[PDB]
Amino acid sequence: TIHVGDRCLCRPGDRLGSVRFVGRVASLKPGYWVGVEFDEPVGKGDGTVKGTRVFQCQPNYGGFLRPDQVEVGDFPPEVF
């Protein structure tokens, strides 16, 4: 299970980020979605869907992914 605040690596390409949203979003496709804020500007979006905000996020840092694309783990930003 995926919770808001979780750290993650996301497909494709092991994109590092934080889970900002988990839930259904009708204006996308049916089923559950995970809103991710990436550390780097590798997101397809900015946390909105056709303009409507779902989670706070800046342009190029936001993605909505299916849960199968999200690996929750201990992935803190590298600092040392």
Numbering used by the authors: 153 to 232
What does the paper say about this structure?
Five tubulin-binding cofactors (TBCs) are implicated in late-stage tubulin folding and heterodimer assembly 1,5–10. TBC-B and TBC-E are implicated in binding α-tubulin, whereas TBC-A and TBC-D interact with β-tubulin. TBC-B comprises an N-terminal ubiquitin-like (Ubl) domain and a C-terminal cytoskeleton-associated protein with glycine-rich segment (CAP-Gly) domain.
